[PDB]
Write a protein that binds this ligand. Structure first.
Ligand SMILES: CCCCCCCC(=O)OC[C@H](COP(=O)(O)O[C@@H]1[C@H](O)[C@H](OP(=O)(O)O)[C@@H](O)[C@H](OP(=O)(O)O)[C@H]1O)OC(=O)CCCCCCC
Ligand SMILES: CCCCCCCC(=O)OC[C@H](COP(=O)(O)O[C@@H]1[C@H](O)[C@H](OP(=O)(O)O)[C@@H](O)[C@H](OP(=O)(O)O)[C@H]1O)OC(=O)CCCCCCC
Ligand SMILES: CCCCCCCC(=O)OC[C@H](COP(=O)(O)O[C@@H]1[C@H](O)[C@H](OP(=O)(O)O)[C@@H](O)[C@H](OP(=O)(O)O)[C@H]1O)OC(=O)CCCCCCC
Ligand SMILES: *[C@@H]1O[C@H](CO)[C@@H](O[C@@H]2O[C@H](CO)[C@@H](O)[C@H](O)[C@H]2NC(C)=O)[C@H](O)[C@H]1NC(C)=O
Ligand code: NA
Ligand code: NA
Lengths: 469, 469, 469, 469
């Protein structure tokens, strides 16, 4: 048993072609896959961008239409500070709603009965929520509260082509005021993509938030969007359904070939392993079995499955049976990234072109072992900064934001702005400012000078082991 | 005397378990400590955030209520430039104060007699301060000044449900005008945390600062906050007092075990040292005694003490006997960081996982010796930039800010903005701008290219000494 | 055949001078070329800057003159949100146009018949474009559209020293409104450069873009500029035409000398190659022939040709036969860069001064081979981020912008701002935000820690091979 | 001749003390010098800051008093766009000037005859400048210009407690309009520093710049400041004159000791050199003579001279014989930096503390040789970017600013903003944008990946040569 088949298996495509009449089908498939998958992603992106733009621009238009005195960029400071201001804002929202068709540049339709759960069939609900009992008397340092939340609702209806004016807010025990209503509009711009326009229903919520009871009432407008096909569409003028099929067939072929290669590898591993058990004791091999498994074909199969799922979802969206543009975009984009990466398989046969992969495979164990110890320090800093500085520092507001701030600091990014945020307000206490000084200096100097230096040293050390000289 | 006990002492928890019936209690304790201390920090953070938000939002509301024409973001340029503007601002502040209940969204109560030290029982004090004698006559390049500061006060009282209008400011010798008053409000939002609301007393100071006599009078509003429990609270609806006890008991157990280990180490060191003095001359060992001391147990004991102190302070705050949220937050956060870090003790038994610690211990002496020489250069630059460029450069205003700017520059951060601040005004003199050019180029090129390179070289050199190959 | 000529050829200028009576003409030429080409670039820059400034300042003035309520910096958010606002903006533009001479600080002349292609001889065209048939009825989730674009035009003429007021916009099917007109003005500031002023014709287009049909209509103003000489110029007061000739002659001399050197090298290579074919088998040498070619002379010849072309174009522009300032500026600037770089030729004879060039020549093959594998990963990330995040992330809007963002991220620049753009809106979906987290963390950690580290290792490895020790 | 004196000379202070009764006077002097010079710098900084703040705040106040509609931050876009706007701005400036005492918060005095050179004894000059002959007729693409500048002046005088209203601007040939006047005020805040207030004369120039003739007229206000002592000052209440003498004496002592050491070194070098010429041929030594010269004493002497000059200038300023605060601040700050640095002399005797200095001395020759080649590339890029992109890119406006931009780019700073400035306007031509892409990508990749990597490699290589292992 000379066993030249083992050597044949771990051969490059050129070597396999020189050996047998083996034309490389997987490689040319992968090139075609890169081209077609990238083109499909871009084609989908046209429609996806149209949808996102429609949503965002309608929301901005609503903010200008319904928020008294609103200007772009003021969103996070937009607030009322007097009873008169609050009343004027609420009444302005309702009044603008009642005359929308006469003023708006967009073609909106009212949605009868879309006033929210506290609506009783009316199209707009004007709700104020307050404590069941509130007896706030700071003058005597006394209060009597029943924290039960009471909802008082006023129903408003559009004229088919007043009551809300008599609103009396219980300011001292007010929790919030909300305005709920729905508007319907058609995304006509989809015609530029030879698609039939969909019906969009925007659910608009305006909140006057007094939950802090701090004398300042933040005002915000949020929208939910529901996309569905029009009941009676008609376009007079009215290819990629076949391009999606082409992508699907290419990815199916790649999947089949890669699965055949994986089964071949499994069989070869099993035959070699039993022959070895015959050559010496039985059960010699524990991990070389895994070495027989090449992860590039696994990656390719995963990418094929993701691409097929994305293509099917895209076909459903075009067919109007689905409106999940974000999920489809994520599937297609991840697939595109993986398809581009997978071609690296054929560069690993040439050591001069495989520096990155070889280095990574030799460095990963030590890197992971080092990161075990770095993780505890990093998480301790994350939690400490999140709780201690979160109230005072804009960049420490949430756990994910604290992580972003610390990760950027490790990379030397946004350092002075991080210090200056504390200089600006000192945390309104010299002790908090001093703590921020210690926290930031220590974290930056540790992670930049020791952790990152040693991490890089491990990477370059691995490279030094694998480089030919 | 075979002395296997010495070897037993410097053994890993797994080795100690294999040797005797020694179950690792300190390690599992540390894991439990990490969990419970982190959870306690987050739980405290809920309340701490509520308090901070109340303070900040009330201050912003005051700025909008009392500062004529105030808009968010203008705080550092907000100023008056004419006598009419100054008078209008002062009168607007007082007028808004007198009608606060009718306009404010928050429920504020006046504080009778809270008008400050220059108040004589009135709730608002309107004070102007000027030189005792001022005869400023620029026309003749003459002046006659008695720098004694005279305070002239006007008392204002709220209506229990005018005089200040006749204010005549001595502009040519005016130092500043201040408005002092106090407002009381209840932080009702604490109910969301199942806590009883506290009474907050805000001390409000508005300053029209003419100390520069420059024709521009900066206007600012500052608040002090005093938190105390309400006299007669009553909430109808109304666990972590036991979680704090759990944390305290866990940290006490860890403290006891670590102290026992430290005493054991001391005894072992003393016995080994006398046996060595018997084996050879007396008083051989000078520093290995210190090697017998393991600093991880010292760190753990310190963390336990800090955690207990923070927990006790938190219990006091909940009990309403204390309102020091910043001190408690700092104690708890530092404790959390130290508790997370301390688990690294058990990674030091495995050289593959101890790269950071081992490198640091070998590199620290050379790093400190190098930093001795770098410190003099750094401090010279700090003082030079603080005095020479502080007047002209926003980022060189104070010593701490100069240090932040230089430290960020060392890390390659905010470079062009630092240059552009000087380009914008040139320091209003070509000589100062040229000096800034030399200062910045020299500091950046020295510290980035030589100091940091050599510092990193020392770190990686230490790592090269300690890495197995 | 001793063949000392080969050794003579690969000799330094000092060695050649010591050998024969060879004075270095190319080196002194290159120094003179650097001086004269740099001076010529700066001299041209005077005029170029004047032209650019005229264009930009006129455009800003038009934006202030014709865009109702326009303020600097609002350009990308400037939009209308109500029918009244749109009508007011359009009418304001036309009204300001009709009274331009009475109000504008610049001296503009109307251009009769410059109203655009849809003008029928009038100086201003006010066009609205809408669908041929539009029956948008969101109320019933129905529409009937003929996507044919209909253009309806109103002609306006200036008074030689109304109809447009009756404009009725078809809002529900409106695509856009445009205002086209032309203005003529003289760039008098060119007199400061002793040049005769040119006639500028600005083509002004104002667009009210409703292509999104989103209830928000962006308003923008764009200008095309046409530069031509005045028919009857007359300046009473009225050197570098000779400086351009000097530059041309210097570059011609350099070109001739370098071409002679290249021909000499070719002849020497051909003689050596045939002598070698005589010494051993025929056709021994395959690539040393190319080694006989020195690329510095090729670079110099290219720079000479570019400098001559730029100088000729500059002479044409001065003569008023050409107005292509950007092309000329690019030719002259590239030439200047190349002329400065080319002097490095004479530093390559001294190994202590040739570190950069020698390192680069040894490192380039491995660097290119490594970049082959890095390119696929980089392009996969580029496409994925462009499509998936382009709609949600300001820095991922276009392919070139995505490339700029990723390239800057590789260099550790603008990291936290990139994360915060996603924090601000979350992509309006938690799934998109999570994907952005994974995308950014993975790309940054891969490219900063592995790719860049290995790239630098390759560079320093090459340097280690070429450094004398 | 055993010559132990040579070895004695190159000995550390501790070794010299152990050898003879040599107490280290220079070292303790240097410590005292650091303390006293730093304190003196800070003390001077108090006064310097007061002066700068007075100047800046008065200028801001003038901008608010005289610039119609001015708001903070608008300075670089502040401009007029219509004839009415221009007239209103000019008249507002003059009107506000005429009622300054009634409105301003500062105490300003008019300066009779301070209206500038074109004033004929009046306190305010209102000048318009225009071409001697201007016949701008864009309608016919004709012009007739006599570029001679004609100045037409209107004199305005303050009421001692109209004509300017009839100003007719020649818009079509207007070059600029200026308003010149002077105001006098006293810097009373200097009293807080126990100093007698000085008289400040502000020269105010307001420019309406039409030099571009672009339909947009930038408006700016600039001030010159002249400081002189008051004629008749009188302060009722009214140490560092002795602290300056203490600094002077300390620096004189250091100077004398260092000069004595330098003379000693010269004599020792001369004696050793002649003894060597006796031991072997004459004129053996060429450069070791220079090795006998220690540059730290030269640095110290330079620092002493600078400190003495700064102290004398500071004494003159306090005495009111001088007002050059910037020159004095620069002298004192540079002196402080040098005094701090000079203490490094005593760390060079201990190799563990001398890593930086030793590395630098071994690396400097190779670093300078490498920088020779890098300089040509850097300068070529600087000039190319300055001319080609200066008109289009905010960060390439001037040579110094281009250098700052490129230097920051080398350090990885402000990269995406540099790209985005070009994305925003594309240079208003796709060709310029493409060139910017090539320019930036090439410069960044070359300088970050090759130049900086090799520079650092040279530094660390030198360190590797000098490190003990
Ligand atoms: C269930 C899957 C059936 C696969 C049938 C393939 C039959 C066939 O012709 O093989 C050559 C190529 C595909 O073959 P392909 O996958 O490209 O090539 C194989 C790989 O090179 C493999 O090595 P690795 O790359 O390292 O895993 C090697 O061991 C195999 O040798 P071996 O076969 O001697 O053991 C090759 O055949 O065929 C086409 O070009 C597609 C024709 C389109 C119709 C495909 C119908 C599915
Ligand atoms: C005053 C303190 C009294 C400590 C009493 C402990 C008695 C006991 O059972 O030991 C085993 C563990 C704690 O024991 P623990 O501290 O976890 O374990 C010790 C450490 O491993 C130590 O090495 P280092 O880690 O390197 O310092 C080793 O030398 C000791 O061996 P040795 O004793 O043979 O000399 C171990 O006993 O006990 C519990 O699991 C807690 C039971 C809860 C009740 C604790 C009451 C305080
Ligand atoms: C014209 C200058 C006259 C200098 C007179 C100094 C006479 C005196 O006492 O020397 C010891 C110290 C100063 O002496 P000082 O400069 O601190 O010390 C000298 C340095 O250590 C020098 O080495 P380097 O540091 O490497 O250059 C060394 O060669 C000299 O040895 P040598 O003399 O045997 O050749 C030392 O005397 O004296 C005071 O402590 C100041 C007393 C205040 C009054 C000073 C009056 C000026
Ligand atoms: C207003 O325009 C005039 C005319 O261009 C400028 O006058 C020049 O001023 C400079 C500096 O004061 C002199 O060196 C020149 O000789 C003057 N004449 C010319 C023809 O340049 C004047 O500088 C401008 N004023 C401002 C404030 O920009
Ligand atoms: Na950086
Ligand atoms: Na940065």
């Amino acid at each position: 048993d000379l066993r030249r088949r083992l050597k044949y298996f771990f051969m490059s495509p050129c070597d396999k072609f020189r050996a047998k009449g083996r034309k490389p089908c997987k490689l040319m498939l992968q090139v075609v896959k890169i081209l077609v998958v990238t083109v499909q992603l871009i084609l989908f992106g046209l429609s996806n961008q149209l949808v996102v733009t429609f949503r965002e621009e309608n929301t901005i238009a609503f903010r200008h239409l319904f928020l008294l005195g609103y200007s772009d960029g003021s969103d996070d400071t937009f607030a009322a500070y007097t009873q008169e201001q609050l009343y004027q804002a609420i009444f302005y929202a309702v009044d603008q709603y009642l005359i929308l068709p006469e003023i708006s540049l967009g073609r909106y339709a009212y949605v009868r009965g879309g006033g929210g759960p506290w609506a009783n069939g009316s199209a707009l609900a004007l709700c104020q929520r307050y404590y069941h009992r509130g007896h706030v008397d700071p003058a005597n340092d006394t209060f009597d509260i029943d924290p039960r939340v009471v909802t008082d609702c006023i129903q408003v209806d559009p004229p088919d082509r007043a009551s809300y004016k008599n609103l009396t807010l219980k300011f001292h025990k007010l929790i919030n005021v909300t305005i709920h209503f729905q508007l319907k509009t058609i995304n006509l711009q989809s015609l530029i993509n030879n698609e039939i326009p969909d019906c969009y229903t925007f659910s608009i919520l305006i909140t006057f938030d007094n939950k802090a009871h701090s004398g300042r009432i933040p005002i915000r407008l949020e929208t939910k969007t529901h996309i569905q096909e029009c009941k009676h569409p008609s376009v007079s003028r009215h290819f990629r359904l076949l391009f999606d099929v082409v992508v699907i067939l290419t990815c199916s072929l790649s999947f089949l070939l890669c699965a055949r290669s994986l089964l071949r590898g499994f069989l070869l591993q099993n035959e070699f392993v039993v022959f070895m058990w015959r050559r010496r004791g039985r059960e010699i091999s524990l991990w070389e079995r895994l070495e027989f498994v090449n992860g590039w074909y696994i990656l390719l199969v995963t990418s094929d499955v993701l691409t097929i799922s994305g293509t099917v979802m895209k076909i459903g969206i075009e067919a109007k049976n689905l409106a999940s543009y974000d999920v489809c975009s994520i599937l297609l984009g991840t697939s595109t990234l993986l398809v581009w990466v997978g071609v690296i398989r054929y560069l690993t046969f040439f050591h001069k072109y495989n520096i990155l992969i070889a280095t990574l495979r030799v460095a990963l164990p030590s890197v992971m072992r080092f990161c075990c110890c770095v993780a505890v320090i990093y998480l301790g800093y994350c939690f400490c900064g999140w709780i201690v500085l979160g109230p005072y520092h804009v960049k420490f507001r949430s756990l994910s934001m604290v992580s972003e701030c610390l990760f950027s600091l490790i990379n030397g990014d946004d350092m002075f702005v991080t210090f200056a945020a504390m200089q600006a307000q000192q945390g309104h206490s010299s002790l908090v400012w001093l703590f921020s000084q210690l926290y930031l200096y220590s974290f930056i100097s540790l992670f930049i000078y020791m952790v990152l230096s040693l991490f890089i040293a491990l990477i370059t050390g691995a490279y030094d082991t694998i480089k030919h000289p």
